[PDB]
Coordinates of C-alpha atoms and ligand atoms in Angstrom, one line a residue:
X1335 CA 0.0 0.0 0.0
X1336 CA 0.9 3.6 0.0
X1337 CA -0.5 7.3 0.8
X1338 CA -2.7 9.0 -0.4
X1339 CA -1.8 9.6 -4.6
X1340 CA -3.7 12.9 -4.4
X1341 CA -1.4 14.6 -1.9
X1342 CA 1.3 13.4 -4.0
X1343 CA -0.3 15.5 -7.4
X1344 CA 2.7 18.0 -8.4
X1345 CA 0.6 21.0 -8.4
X1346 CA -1.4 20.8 -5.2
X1347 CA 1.7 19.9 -3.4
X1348 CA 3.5 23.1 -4.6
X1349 CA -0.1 24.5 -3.6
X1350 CA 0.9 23.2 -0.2
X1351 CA 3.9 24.1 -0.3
X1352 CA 3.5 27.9 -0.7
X1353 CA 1.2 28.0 2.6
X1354 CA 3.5 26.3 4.7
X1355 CA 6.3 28.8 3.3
X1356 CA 4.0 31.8 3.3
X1357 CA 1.8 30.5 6.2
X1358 CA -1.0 30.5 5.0
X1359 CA -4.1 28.5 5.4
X1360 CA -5.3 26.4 2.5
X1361 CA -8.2 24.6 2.4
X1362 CA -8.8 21.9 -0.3
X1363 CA -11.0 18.5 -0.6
X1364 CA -8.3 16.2 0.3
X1365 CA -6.2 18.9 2.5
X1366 CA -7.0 21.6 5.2
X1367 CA -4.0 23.6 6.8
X1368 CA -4.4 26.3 9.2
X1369 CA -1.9 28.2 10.4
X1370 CA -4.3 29.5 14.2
X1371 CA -3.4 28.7 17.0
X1372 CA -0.3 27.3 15.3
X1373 CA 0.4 25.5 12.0
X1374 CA -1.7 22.2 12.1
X1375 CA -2.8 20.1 8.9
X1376 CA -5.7 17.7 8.3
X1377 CA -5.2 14.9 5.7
X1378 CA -8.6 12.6 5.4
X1379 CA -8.5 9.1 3.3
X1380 CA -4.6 9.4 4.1
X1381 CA -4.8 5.9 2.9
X1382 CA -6.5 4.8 0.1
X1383 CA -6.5 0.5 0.7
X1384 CA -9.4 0.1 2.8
X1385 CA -7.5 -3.6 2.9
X1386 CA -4.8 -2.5 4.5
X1387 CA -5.9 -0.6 7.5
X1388 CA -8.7 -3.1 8.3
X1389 CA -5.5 -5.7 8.2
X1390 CA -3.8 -2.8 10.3
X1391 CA -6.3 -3.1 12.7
X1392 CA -6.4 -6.1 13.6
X1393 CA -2.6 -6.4 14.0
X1394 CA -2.7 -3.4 16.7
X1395 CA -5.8 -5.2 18.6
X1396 CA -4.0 -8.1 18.3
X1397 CA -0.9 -6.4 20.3
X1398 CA -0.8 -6.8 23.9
X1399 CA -1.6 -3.2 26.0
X1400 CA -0.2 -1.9 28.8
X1401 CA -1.5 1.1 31.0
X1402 CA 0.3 4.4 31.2
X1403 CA -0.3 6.8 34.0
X1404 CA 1.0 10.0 36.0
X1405 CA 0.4 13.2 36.3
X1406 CA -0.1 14.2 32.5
X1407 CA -2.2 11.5 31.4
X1408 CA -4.4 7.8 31.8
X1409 CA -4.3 5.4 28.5
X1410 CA -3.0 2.2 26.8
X1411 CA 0.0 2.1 25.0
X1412 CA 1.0 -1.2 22.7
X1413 CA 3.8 -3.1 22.5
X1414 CA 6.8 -1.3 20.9
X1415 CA 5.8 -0.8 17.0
X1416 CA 9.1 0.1 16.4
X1417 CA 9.8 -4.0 17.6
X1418 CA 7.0 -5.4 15.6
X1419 CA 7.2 -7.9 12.5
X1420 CA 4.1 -8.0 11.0
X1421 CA 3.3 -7.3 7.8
X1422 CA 0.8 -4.0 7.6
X1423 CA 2.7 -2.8 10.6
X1424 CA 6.0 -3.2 8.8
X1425 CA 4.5 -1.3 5.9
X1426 CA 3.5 1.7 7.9
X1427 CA 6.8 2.2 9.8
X1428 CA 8.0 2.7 5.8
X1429 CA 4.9 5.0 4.3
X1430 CA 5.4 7.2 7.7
X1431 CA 9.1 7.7 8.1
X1432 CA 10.5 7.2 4.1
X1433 CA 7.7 8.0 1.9
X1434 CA 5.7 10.9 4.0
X1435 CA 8.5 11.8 5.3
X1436 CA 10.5 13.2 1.7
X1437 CA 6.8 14.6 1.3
X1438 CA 6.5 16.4 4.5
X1439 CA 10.3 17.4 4.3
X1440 CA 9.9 18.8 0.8
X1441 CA 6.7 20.8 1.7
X1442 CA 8.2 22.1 5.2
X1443 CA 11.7 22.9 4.2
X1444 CA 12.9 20.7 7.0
X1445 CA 15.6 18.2 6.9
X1446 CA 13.6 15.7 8.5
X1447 CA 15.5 12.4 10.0
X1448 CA 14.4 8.7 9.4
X1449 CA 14.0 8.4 12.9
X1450 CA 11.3 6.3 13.9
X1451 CA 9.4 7.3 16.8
X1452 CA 6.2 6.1 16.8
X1453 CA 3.4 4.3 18.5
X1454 CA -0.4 2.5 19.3
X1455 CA -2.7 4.2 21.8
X1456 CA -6.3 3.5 22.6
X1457 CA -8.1 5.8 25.1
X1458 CA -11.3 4.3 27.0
X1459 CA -13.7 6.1 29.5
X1460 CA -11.7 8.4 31.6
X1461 CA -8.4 8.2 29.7
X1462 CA -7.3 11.5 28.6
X1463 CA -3.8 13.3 28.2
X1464 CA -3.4 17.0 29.3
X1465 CA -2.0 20.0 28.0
X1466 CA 1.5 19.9 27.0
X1467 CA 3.5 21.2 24.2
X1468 CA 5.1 17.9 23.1
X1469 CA 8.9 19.5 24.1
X1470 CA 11.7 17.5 23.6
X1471 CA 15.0 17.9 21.7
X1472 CA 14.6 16.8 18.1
X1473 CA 10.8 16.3 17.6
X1474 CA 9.9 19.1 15.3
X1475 CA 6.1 17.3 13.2
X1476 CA 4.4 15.4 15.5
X1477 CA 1.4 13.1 13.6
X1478 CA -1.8 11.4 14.4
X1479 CA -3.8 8.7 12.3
X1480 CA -6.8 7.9 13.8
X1481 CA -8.2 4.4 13.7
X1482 CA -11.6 4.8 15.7
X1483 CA -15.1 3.1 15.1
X1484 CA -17.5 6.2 13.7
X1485 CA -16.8 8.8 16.5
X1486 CA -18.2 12.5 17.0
X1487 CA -17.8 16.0 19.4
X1488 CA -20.0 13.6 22.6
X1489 CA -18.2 11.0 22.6
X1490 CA -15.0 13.0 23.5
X1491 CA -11.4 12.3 22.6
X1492 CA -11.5 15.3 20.3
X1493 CA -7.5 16.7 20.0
X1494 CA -7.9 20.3 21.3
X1495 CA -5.5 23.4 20.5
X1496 CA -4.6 26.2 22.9
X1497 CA -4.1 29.6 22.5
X1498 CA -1.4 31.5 23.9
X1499 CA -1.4 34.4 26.7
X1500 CA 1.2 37.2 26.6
X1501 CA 3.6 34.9 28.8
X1502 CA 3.8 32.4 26.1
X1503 CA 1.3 30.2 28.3
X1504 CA -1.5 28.4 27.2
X1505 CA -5.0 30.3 27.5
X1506 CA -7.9 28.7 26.4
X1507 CA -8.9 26.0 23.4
X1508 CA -9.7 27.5 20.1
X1509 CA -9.8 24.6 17.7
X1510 CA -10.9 21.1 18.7
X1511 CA -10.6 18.4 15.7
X1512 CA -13.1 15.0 16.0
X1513 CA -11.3 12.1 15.2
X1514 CA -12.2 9.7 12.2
X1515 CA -10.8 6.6 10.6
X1516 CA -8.1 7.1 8.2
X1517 CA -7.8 10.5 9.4
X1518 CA -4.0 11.7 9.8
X1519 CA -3.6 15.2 11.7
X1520 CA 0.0 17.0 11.9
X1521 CA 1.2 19.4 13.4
X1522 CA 4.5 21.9 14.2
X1523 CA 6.1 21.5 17.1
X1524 CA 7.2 24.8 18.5
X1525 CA 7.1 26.6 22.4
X1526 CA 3.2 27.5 21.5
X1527 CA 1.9 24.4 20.2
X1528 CA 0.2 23.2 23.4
X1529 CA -2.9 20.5 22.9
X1530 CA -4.3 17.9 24.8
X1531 CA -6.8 14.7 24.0
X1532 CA -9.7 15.7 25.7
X1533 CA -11.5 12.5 28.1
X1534 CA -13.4 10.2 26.2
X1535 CA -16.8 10.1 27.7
X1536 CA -17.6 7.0 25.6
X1537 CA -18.4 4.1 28.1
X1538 CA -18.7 1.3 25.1
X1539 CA -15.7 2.8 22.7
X1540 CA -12.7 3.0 22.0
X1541 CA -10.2 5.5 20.1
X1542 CA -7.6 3.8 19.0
X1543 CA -4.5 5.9 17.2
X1544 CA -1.2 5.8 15.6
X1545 CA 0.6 8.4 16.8
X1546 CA 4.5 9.7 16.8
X1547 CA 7.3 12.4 15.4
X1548 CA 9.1 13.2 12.9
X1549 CA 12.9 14.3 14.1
X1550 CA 14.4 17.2 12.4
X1551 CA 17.3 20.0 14.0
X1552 CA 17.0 21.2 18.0
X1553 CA 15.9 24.8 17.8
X1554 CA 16.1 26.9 21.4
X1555 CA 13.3 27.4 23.4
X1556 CA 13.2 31.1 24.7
X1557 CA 14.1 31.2 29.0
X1558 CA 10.5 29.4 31.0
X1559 CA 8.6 31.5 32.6
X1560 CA 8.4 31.9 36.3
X1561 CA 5.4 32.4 38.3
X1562 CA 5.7 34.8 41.2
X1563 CA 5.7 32.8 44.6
X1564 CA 2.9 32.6 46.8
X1565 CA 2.9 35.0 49.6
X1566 CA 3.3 32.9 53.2
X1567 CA 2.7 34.4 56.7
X1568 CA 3.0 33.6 60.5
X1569 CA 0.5 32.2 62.7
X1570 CA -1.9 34.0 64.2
X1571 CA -1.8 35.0 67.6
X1572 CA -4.6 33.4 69.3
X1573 CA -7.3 35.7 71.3
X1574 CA -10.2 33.7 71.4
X1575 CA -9.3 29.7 72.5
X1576 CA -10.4 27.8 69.1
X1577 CA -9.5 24.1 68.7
X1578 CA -11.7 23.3 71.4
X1579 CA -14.9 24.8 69.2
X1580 CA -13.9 22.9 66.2
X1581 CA -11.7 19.8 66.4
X1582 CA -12.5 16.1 67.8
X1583 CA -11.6 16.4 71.2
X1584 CA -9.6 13.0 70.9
X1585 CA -6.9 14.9 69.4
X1586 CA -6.1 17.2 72.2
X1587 CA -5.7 14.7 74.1
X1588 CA -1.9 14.1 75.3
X1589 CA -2.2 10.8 75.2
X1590 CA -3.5 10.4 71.5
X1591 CA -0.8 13.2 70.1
X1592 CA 2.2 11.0 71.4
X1593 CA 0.6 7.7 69.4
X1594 CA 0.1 10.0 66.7
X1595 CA 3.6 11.0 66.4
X1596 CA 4.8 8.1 66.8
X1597 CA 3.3 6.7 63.8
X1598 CA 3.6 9.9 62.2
X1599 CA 8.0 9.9 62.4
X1600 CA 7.9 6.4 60.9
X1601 CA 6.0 7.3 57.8
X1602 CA 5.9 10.9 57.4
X1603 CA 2.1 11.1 56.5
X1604 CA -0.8 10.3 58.5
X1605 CA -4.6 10.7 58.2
X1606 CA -6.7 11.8 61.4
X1607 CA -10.6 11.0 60.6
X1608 CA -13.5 12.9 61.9
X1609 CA -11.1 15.6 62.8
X1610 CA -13.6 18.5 62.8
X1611 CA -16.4 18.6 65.7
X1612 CA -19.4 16.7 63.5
X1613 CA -21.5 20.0 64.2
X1614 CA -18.9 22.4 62.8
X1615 CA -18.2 20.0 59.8
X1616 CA -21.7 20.3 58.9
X1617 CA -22.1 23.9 59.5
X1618 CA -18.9 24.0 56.9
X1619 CA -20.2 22.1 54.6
X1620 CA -24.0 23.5 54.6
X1621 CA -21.9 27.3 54.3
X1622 CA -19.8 25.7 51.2
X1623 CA -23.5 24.8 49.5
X1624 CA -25.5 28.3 50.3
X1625 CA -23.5 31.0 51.7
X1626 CA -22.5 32.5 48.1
X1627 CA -19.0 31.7 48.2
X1628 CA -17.2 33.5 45.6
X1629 CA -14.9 30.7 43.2
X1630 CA -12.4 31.7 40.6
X1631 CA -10.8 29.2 37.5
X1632 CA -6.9 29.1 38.4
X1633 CA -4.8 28.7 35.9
X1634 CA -3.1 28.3 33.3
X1635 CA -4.1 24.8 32.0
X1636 CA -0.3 23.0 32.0
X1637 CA -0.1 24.0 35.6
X1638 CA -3.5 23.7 36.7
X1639 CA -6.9 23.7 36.4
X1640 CA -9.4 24.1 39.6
X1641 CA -11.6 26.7 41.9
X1642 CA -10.5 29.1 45.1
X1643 CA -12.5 30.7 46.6
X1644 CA -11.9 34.8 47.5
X1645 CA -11.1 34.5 51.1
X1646 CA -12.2 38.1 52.0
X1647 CA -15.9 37.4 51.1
X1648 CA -16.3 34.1 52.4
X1649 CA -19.2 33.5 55.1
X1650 CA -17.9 34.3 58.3
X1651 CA -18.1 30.1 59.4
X1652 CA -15.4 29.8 56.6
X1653 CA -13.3 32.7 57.6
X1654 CA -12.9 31.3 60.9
X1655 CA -12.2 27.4 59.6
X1656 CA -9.1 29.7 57.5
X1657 CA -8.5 31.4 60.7
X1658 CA -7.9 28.2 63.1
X1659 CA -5.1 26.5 60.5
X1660 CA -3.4 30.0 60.6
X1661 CA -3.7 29.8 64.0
X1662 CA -1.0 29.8 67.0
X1663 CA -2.7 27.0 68.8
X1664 CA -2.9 24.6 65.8
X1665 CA 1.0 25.4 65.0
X1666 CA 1.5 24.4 68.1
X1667 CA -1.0 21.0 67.8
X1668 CA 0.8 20.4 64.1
X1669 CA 4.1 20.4 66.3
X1670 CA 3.0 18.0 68.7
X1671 CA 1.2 15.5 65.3
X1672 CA 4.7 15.6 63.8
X1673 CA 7.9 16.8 66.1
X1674 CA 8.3 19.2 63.9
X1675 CA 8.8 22.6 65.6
X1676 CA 5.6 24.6 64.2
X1677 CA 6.0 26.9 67.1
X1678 CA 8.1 28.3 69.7
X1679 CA 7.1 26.1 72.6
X1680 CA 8.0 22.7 70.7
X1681 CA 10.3 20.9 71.5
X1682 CA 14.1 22.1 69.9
X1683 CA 16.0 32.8 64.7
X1684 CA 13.7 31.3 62.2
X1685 CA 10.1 32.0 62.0
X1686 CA 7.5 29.0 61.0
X1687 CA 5.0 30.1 58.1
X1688 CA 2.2 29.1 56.2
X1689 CA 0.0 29.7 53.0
X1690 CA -3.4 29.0 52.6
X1691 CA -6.9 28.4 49.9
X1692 CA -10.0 27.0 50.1
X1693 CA -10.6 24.9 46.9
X1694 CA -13.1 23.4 44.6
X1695 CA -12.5 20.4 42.6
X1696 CA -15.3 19.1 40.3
X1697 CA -15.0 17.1 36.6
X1698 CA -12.5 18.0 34.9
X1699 CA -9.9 19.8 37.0
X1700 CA -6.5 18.9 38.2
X1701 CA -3.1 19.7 38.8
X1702 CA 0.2 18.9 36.4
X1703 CA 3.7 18.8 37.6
X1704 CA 5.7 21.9 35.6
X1705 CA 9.2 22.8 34.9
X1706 CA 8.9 25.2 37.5
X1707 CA 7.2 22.5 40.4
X1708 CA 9.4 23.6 43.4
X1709 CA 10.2 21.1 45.9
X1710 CA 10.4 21.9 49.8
X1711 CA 10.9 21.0 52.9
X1712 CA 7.3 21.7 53.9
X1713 CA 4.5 20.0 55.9
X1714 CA 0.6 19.4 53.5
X1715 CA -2.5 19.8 55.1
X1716 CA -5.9 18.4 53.6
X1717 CA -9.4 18.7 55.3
X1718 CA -11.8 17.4 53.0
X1719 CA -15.7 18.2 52.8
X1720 CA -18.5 17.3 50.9
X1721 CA -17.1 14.3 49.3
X1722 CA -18.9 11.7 50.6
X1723 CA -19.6 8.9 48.2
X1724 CA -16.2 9.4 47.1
X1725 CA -14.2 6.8 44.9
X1726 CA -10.3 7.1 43.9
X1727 CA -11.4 5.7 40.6
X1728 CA -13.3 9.0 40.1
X1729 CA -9.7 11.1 40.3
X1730 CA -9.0 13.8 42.9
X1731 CA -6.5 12.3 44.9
X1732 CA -3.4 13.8 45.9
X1733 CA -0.2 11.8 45.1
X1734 CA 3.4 12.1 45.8
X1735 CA 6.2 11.2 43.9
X1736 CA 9.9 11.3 43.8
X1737 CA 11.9 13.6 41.7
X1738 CA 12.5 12.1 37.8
X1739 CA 11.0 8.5 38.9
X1740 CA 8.0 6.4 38.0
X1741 CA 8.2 5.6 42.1
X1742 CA 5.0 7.0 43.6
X1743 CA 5.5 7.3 47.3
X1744 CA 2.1 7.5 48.6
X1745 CA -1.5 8.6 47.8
X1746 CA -4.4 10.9 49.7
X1747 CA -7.8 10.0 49.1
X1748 CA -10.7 12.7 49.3
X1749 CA -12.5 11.5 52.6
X1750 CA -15.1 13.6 54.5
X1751 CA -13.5 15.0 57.9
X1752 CA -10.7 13.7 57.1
X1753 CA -7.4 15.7 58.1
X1754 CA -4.1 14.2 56.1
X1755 CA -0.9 15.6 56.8
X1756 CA 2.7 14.8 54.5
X1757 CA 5.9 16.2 55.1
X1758 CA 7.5 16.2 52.1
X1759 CA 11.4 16.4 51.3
X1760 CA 13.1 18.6 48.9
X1761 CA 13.2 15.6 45.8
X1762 CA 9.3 15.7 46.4
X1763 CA 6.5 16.5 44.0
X1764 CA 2.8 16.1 44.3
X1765 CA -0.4 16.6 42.1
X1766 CA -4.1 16.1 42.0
X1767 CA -5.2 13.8 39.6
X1768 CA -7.3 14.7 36.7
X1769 CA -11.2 14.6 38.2
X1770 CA -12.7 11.9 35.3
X1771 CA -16.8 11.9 34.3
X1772 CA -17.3 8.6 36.6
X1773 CA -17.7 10.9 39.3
X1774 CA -20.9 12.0 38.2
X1775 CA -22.3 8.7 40.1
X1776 CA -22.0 11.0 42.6
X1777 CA -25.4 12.6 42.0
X1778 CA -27.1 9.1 42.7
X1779 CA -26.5 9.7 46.2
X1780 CA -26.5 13.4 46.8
X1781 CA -27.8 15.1 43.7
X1782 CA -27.6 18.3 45.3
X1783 CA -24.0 18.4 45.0
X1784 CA -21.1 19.1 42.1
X1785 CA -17.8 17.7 43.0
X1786 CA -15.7 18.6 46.2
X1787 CA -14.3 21.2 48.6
X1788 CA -10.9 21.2 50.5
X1789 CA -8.8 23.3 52.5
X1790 CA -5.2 23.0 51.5
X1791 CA -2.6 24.4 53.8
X1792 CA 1.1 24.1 53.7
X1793 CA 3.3 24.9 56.9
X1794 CA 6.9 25.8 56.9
X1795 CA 9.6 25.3 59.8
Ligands
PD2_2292 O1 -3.2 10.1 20.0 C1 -3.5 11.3 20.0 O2 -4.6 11.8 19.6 C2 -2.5 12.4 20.4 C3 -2.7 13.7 20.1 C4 -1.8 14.6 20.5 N1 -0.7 14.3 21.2 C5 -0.5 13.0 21.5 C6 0.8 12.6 22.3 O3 1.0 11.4 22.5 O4 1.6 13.5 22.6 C7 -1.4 12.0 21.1
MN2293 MN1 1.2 15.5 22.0

């Protein structure tokens, strides 16, 4: 088999050719290049044996899968193509990286490589990959060809393009392409081309994909941008005695904090249930559903995606739950949980600080490790409400991992009431897992309610 003989015509190709030189969109029956958000091409029928890919096909579902997961994404990837024998696979590897190649090289002006580097994917319900920009020295085309039963915009899956902001960050999505079969999508890689395969909401299907890059010349990114750092503060002096008003009077107990700590020095991460007074938790709660808390999208979508609320308008219930893990007396109770010294009066410049937000998660948001993910010496603190019905398979957990490893090192669980605490170590990075569409069996048991709140505090010695 081969590529499509159309694409290959002398004077459409020369047609292509001057877009990609001028940049320039074209549009044509059997090609559409645009050049917004960034220069992106659309090839249907890319090839023309319906033999061959049904053959194709079955030699991909006939591979052996394995799952892929972190941060950035949840799918199936094949056994190595580039290891493969069999015949239509063999034929591929050949069509992609020596015949489209010349093609592509010739159109682009790029000295392409040979280089194979490509593979099988096949995203069911929940599986999705998040924004990124595809970065890494030598990829310069990256390439798509879709594979999927008929498909369309509900079924999700779609391959969505970002804009950029005036920080060379990803905004919002301005072009969203629906995959079909024979379909092959390319694309430039550059510092702006940031997409992501949205989840596929498709609980019977599956969209399976051939997907790589074709190497060509390292360029230089321009210097990545830094965020400015998030302002931290002392405790609060306390004036009016507060832990007794809100938390389970089992942890101010003597006896219990020792226990506690003990456990707490051998792992470096404990979970303390029904830590809030029951009557406070639901006055929390029943203030996160109708007191008119104010929530705002954070940003921007390869760092982050999720809600916090303005602290300064908040119902004054919630104002005071901010107020008691800024305060002395839990600095003080956080020393005696960990042995770490929160506060002057613990045991033996320096002065201990914290920052705070009150957060809501619902489908859809998450949290992505980023060139810039600082790692600290630094004590986490979760209280989670509303999330009862909770299941990690719906996404929202917190997980820790060590520095450039596969290792995860642990995993926090949304839990109602329930306090976790994590000291973490300086080659120690976290995320919250991309919130997937099976947590809408939530509403089968409280219907009244989207999603989740926390309050996330971190505390430095
Ligand atoms: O398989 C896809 O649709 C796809 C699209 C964009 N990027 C990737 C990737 O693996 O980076 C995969
Ligand atoms: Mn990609």
């Amino acid at each position: 088999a081969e590529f499509s003989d159309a694409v290959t015509e002398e004077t459409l190709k020369k047609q292509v050719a001057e877009a990609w030189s001028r940049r320039t969109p074209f549009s044509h029956e059997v090609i559409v290049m645009d050049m917004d958000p960034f220069l992106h091409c659309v090839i249907p029928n890319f090839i023309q044996s319906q033999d061959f890919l049904e053959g194709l096909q079955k030699e991909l579902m006939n591979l052996d899968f394995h799952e892929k997961y972190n941060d950035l994404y949840k799918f199936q990837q094949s056994d190595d193509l580039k290891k493969r024998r069999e015949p239509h696979i063999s034929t591929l590897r050949k069509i992609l990286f020596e015949d489209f190649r010349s093609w592509l090289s010739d159109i682009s002006k790029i000295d392409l490589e040979s280089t194979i580097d490509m593979s099988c994917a096949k995203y069911e319900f929940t599986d999705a990959l998040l924004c990124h920009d595809d970065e890494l020295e030598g990829r310069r085309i990256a390439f798509i060809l879709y594979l999927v039963p008929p498909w369309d915009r509900s079924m999700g899956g779609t391959l969505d393009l970002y804009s950029i902001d005036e920080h060379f960050q990803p905004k919002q999505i301005v072009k969203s392409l629906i995959p079909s079969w024979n379909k092959l999508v390319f694309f430039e890689v550059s510092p702006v081309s940031f997409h992501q395969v949205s989840e596929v909401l498709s609980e019977e299907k599956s969209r399976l994909s051939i997907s790589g890059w074709f190497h060509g010349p390292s360029l230089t990114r321009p210097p990545n941008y830094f965020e400015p750092p998030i302002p931290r503060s002392p405790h609060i002096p306390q004036d009016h005695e507060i832990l007794y008003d809100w938390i389970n009077p089992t942890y101010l107990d003597m006896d219990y904090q020792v226990q506690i700590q003990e456990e707490f020095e051998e792992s470096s991460e404990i979970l303390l249930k029904e830590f809030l007074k029951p009557e406070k938790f639901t006055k929390v709660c029943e203030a996160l559903e109708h007191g008119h808390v104010e929530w705002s999208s954070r940003g921007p979508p390869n760092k982050r995606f999720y809600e916090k609320a303005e602290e300064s308008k908040l119902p004054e219930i919630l104002k005071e739950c901010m107020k008691l893990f800024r305060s002395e007396a839990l600095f003080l109770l956080l020393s005696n949980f960990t042995g770490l010294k929160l506060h002057f009066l613990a045991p033996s410049s320096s002065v201990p600080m914290c920052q705070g937000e009150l957060r809501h998660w619902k489908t859809g948001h998450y949290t992505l490790i980023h060139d810039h993910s600082k790692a600290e010496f630094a004590l986490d603190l979760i209280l989670y409400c509303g999330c009862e019905g909770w299941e990690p398979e719906y996404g929202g957990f917190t997980s820790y991992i060590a520095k450039g490893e596969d290792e995860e090192l642990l995993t926090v669980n949304p839990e109602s009431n329930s306090l976790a605490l994590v000291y973490r170590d300086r080659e120690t990075l976290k995320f919250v897992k991309h919130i997937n569409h099976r947590s809408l069996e939530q509403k089968k048991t409280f219907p009244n309610r989207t999603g989740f709140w926390d309050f996330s505090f971190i505390y430095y010695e």
